[PDB]
Protein backbone atom coordinates (compact mmCIF):
# COMPACT_ATOMS: atom_id res chain seq x y z
CA UNK A 1 0.00 0.00 0.00
CA UNK A 2 2.69 2.02 0.71
CA UNK A 3 6.08 2.07 1.30
CA UNK A 4 8.74 4.10 3.45
CA UNK A 5 12.24 4.43 2.46
CA UNK A 6 14.61 5.38 5.67
CA UNK A 7 18.34 6.55 5.39
CA UNK A 8 21.59 6.98 7.79
CA UNK A 9 25.05 6.42 8.29
CA UNK A 10 26.45 4.89 11.54
CA UNK A 11 29.67 2.54 12.92
CA UNK A 12 29.69 -1.12 11.40
CA UNK A 13 29.96 -2.23 14.74
CA UNK A 14 26.19 -0.16 15.15
CA UNK A 15 24.50 -2.21 12.09
CA UNK A 16 23.37 -4.92 13.95
CA UNK A 17 21.42 -2.59 15.92
CA UNK A 18 19.36 -2.32 13.63
CA UNK A 19 17.02 -4.84 13.96
CA UNK A 20 13.52 -5.48 15.66
CA UNK A 21 13.51 -5.64 19.53
CA UNK A 22 17.28 -4.45 19.99
CA UNK A 23 18.85 -1.75 22.45
CA UNK A 24 21.66 0.15 22.45
CA UNK A 25 22.40 4.11 22.04
CA UNK A 26 21.36 3.37 18.05
CA UNK A 27 18.48 1.92 18.91
CA UNK A 28 17.18 3.72 21.71
CA UNK A 29 17.97 7.44 21.32
CA UNK A 30 18.52 7.24 17.86
CA UNK A 31 16.50 4.87 15.72
CA UNK A 32 13.83 1.93 16.60
CA UNK A 33 12.46 -0.78 14.86
CA UNK A 34 8.47 -2.16 16.07
CA UNK A 35 8.30 -5.38 17.56
CA UNK A 36 6.61 -6.36 14.28
CA UNK A 37 8.58 -5.04 11.87
CA UNK A 38 7.77 -5.99 7.97
CA UNK A 39 10.70 -4.10 6.17
CA UNK A 40 14.33 -4.90 4.94
CA UNK A 41 17.45 -3.86 6.47
CA UNK A 42 20.21 -2.63 4.17
CA UNK A 43 23.59 -1.63 4.82
CA UNK A 44 27.12 -1.39 2.93
CA UNK A 45 30.72 -0.28 4.17
CA UNK A 46 30.90 3.58 3.21
CA UNK A 47 34.37 4.03 4.09
CA UNK A 48 34.91 5.29 0.63
CA UNK A 49 32.20 8.57 1.10
CA UNK B 1 42.21 -4.76 36.47
CA UNK B 2 45.53 -4.38 34.59
CA UNK B 3 46.17 -8.11 34.09
CA UNK B 4 43.58 -10.41 33.53
CA UNK B 5 43.54 -14.45 33.78
CA UNK B 6 44.32 -17.10 31.17
CA UNK B 7 41.31 -18.85 30.39
CA UNK B 8 42.60 -21.82 31.65
CA UNK B 9 42.54 -20.54 34.58
CA UNK B 10 39.86 -18.32 34.75
CA UNK B 11 39.66 -15.90 37.40
CA UNK B 12 36.19 -15.74 39.54
CA UNK B 13 35.21 -12.75 41.79
CA UNK B 14 31.93 -13.29 44.25
CA UNK B 15 29.56 -10.17 44.38
CA UNK B 16 27.37 -10.09 47.49
CA UNK B 17 25.80 -7.93 50.04
CA UNK B 18 26.11 -5.02 47.34
CA UNK B 19 23.78 -2.90 45.53
CA UNK B 20 24.56 -2.88 41.75
CA UNK B 21 23.70 -0.62 38.71
CA UNK B 22 23.83 -2.62 35.59
CA UNK B 23 22.75 0.23 34.13
CA UNK B 24 26.19 1.97 34.03
CA UNK B 25 27.98 -0.95 32.64
CA UNK B 26 25.37 -1.47 29.74
CA UNK B 27 25.25 1.97 28.70
CA UNK B 28 29.10 2.74 28.96
CA UNK B 29 28.89 2.03 25.35
CA UNK B 30 32.38 0.31 25.91
CA UNK B 31 32.29 -3.09 24.69
CA UNK B 32 32.11 -4.73 21.43
CA UNK B 33 29.62 -7.90 22.78
CA UNK B 34 27.12 -7.90 25.09
CA UNK B 35 24.97 -10.74 25.36
CA UNK B 36 22.35 -12.10 28.61
CA UNK B 37 20.74 -15.32 28.63
CA UNK B 38 17.49 -15.64 30.68
CA UNK B 39 17.89 -12.25 31.52
CA UNK B 40 16.85 -8.88 29.75
CA UNK B 41 19.83 -6.50 29.90
CA UNK B 42 17.54 -3.37 30.42
CA UNK B 43 15.33 -5.14 33.17
CA UNK B 44 18.71 -6.55 34.69
CA UNK B 45 18.80 -3.33 36.71
CA UNK B 46 15.22 -3.53 38.29
CA UNK B 47 15.90 -7.05 39.71
CA UNK B 48 17.49 -8.93 42.64
CA UNK B 49 19.82 -11.57 43.03
Given at each position: ????????????????????????????????????????????????? | ????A??????????????????????????????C?????????????
Amino acid sequence: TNVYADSFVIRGDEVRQIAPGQTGKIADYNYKLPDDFTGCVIAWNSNNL
Amino acid sequence: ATRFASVYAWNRKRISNCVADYSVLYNSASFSTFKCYGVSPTKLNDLCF
